[PDB]
DNA sequence: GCGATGCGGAAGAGAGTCCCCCACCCCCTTTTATAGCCCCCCTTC
């Protein structure tokens, strides 16, 4: 195909293995914001990795915004150290990547009306609700947002192989509905 | 003094022609790409 999707966002969850005091973290953490009325977690941001992480009292933390697997793990470790630097016994346990978001362009307009007809079992095109066709691939459990402009967004992948594999499967299908 | 009762008359049926408590699930939130749609404020004259 000659086109490789580029990851736009990765969601990874890591357990620190120790209960944390959310109020204490907000007071001392540099960028943390805690609003129990709004959300029950502590939202923190670190610019150099350019990622955002949510910290819960149970010790589990979710890291989002990383553009690569290495960045997500590095960003998650940095957040854990910040909590550890606050006097808590934070660790890096069962780090896992929960979601990978990738985007790409096929460089040609797509006839979404034709695509849904031939793939009604997997496609879902509702212009009233969303201007982009939602494709649910089965062999890889990846949900693809195909747009008339040609932009394709892949999400729900656990590994980078699924993102590339999913695009390889849909690209020939899109080529058959080129506008 | 101290009770006790049958019959006529009236009545009446009966037939014919809401508020609370206890699971279970969804959304609150964050990140990102995509794009049409639409609110809101601004600006124009």
UniProtKB/Swiss-Prot annotation:
The keyword ATP-binding does not apply. One of its GO terms (molecular function) is core promoter sequence-specific DNA binding. Its main location: nucleus. GO terms for biological process: DNA-templated transcription initiation; mRNA transcription by RNA polymerase II; positive regulation of transcription initiation by RNA polymerase II; RNA polymerase II preinitiation complex assembly; spermatogenesis; transcription by RNA polymerase II; transcription by RNA polymerase III; transcription initiation at RNA polymerase II promoter. Sequence repeats lie at residues 7-83, 97-174. Widely expressed, with levels highest in the testis and ovary. GO terms for cellular component: chromatin; cytosol; euchromatin; female germ cell nucleus; female pronucleus; male germ cell nucleus; male pronucleus; nucleoplasm. It is found in: Nucleus. It comes from the Eukaryota. The keyword Transcription regulation applies. DNA binds at residues 9, 45, 60, 99, 136. Keywords: Disease variant, DNA-binding, Host-virus interaction, Neurodegeneration, Nucleus, Repeat, Spinocerebellar ataxia, Transcription, Transcription regulation. Binds DNA as monomer. Component of the TFIID basal transcription factor complex, composed of TATA-box-binding protein TBP, and a number of TBP-associated factors (TAFs), including TAF1, TAF2, TAF3, TAF4, TAF5, TAF6, TAF7, TAF8, TAF9, TAF10, TAF11, TAF12 and TAF13. Part of a TFIID-containing RNA polymerase II pre-initiation complex that is composed of TBP and at least GTF2A1, GTF2A2, GTF2E1, GTF2E2, GTF2F1, GTF2H2, GTF2H3, GTF2H4, GTF2H5, GTF2B, TCEA1, ERCC2, ERCC3, TAF1, TAF2, TAF3, TAF4, TAF5, TAF6, TAF7, TAF8, TAF9, TAF10, TAF11, TAF12 and TAF13. The TFIID basal transcription factor complex plays a major role in the initiation of RNA polymerase II (Pol II)-dependent transcription. TFIID recognizes and binds promoters with or without a TATA box via its subunit TBP, a TATA-box-binding protein, and promotes assembly of the pre-initiation complex (PIC). The TFIID complex consists of TBP and TBP-associated factors (TAFs), including TAF1, TAF2, TAF3, TAF4, TAF5, TAF6, TAF7, TAF8, TAF9, TAF10, TAF11, TAF12 and TAF13. The TFIID complex structure can be divided into 3 modules TFIID-A, TFIID-B, and TFIID-C. Belongs to the TBP family. It is linked to Spinocerebellar ataxia 17: Spinocerebellar ataxia is a clinically and genetically heterogeneous group of cerebellar disorders. Patients show progressive incoordination of gait and often poor coordination of hands, speech and eye movements, due to degeneration of the cerebellum with variable involvement of the brainstem and spinal cord. SCA17 is an autosomal dominant cerebellar ataxia (ADCA) characterized by widespread cerebral and cerebellar atrophy, dementia and extrapyramidal signs. The molecular defect in SCA17 is the expansion of a CAG repeat in the coding region of TBP. This is TATA-box-binding protein. The chain holds residues 159 to 337 of 339 of the full protein.
């Amino acid at each position: 195909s000659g086109i490789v999707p580029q990851l736009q966002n990765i969601v990874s969850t890591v357990n620190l293995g120790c209960k944390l005091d959310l109020k204490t973290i907000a007071l001392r953490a540099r960028n943390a914001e805690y609003n129990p009325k709004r959300f029950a977690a502590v939202i923190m941001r670190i610019r150099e990795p350019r990622t955002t992480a949510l910290i819960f009292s149970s010790g589990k933390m979710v890291c989002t915004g990383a553009k690569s697997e290495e960045q997500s793990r590095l960003a998650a470790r940095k957040y854990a150290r910040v909590v550890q630097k606050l006097g808590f016994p934070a660790k890096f346990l069962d780090f896992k990547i929960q979601n990978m978001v990738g985007s790409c362009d096929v460089k040609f307009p797509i006839r979404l009306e034709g695509l849904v007809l031939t793939h009604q079992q997997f496609s879902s095109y509702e212009p009233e609700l969303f201007p982009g066709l939602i494709y649910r691939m089965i062999k890889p459990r990846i949900v693809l947002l195909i747009f008339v402009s040609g932009k394709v967004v892949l999400t729900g992948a656990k590994v980078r192989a699924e993102i590339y594999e999913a695009f390889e499967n849909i690209y020939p299908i899109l080529k058959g509905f080129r506008k």
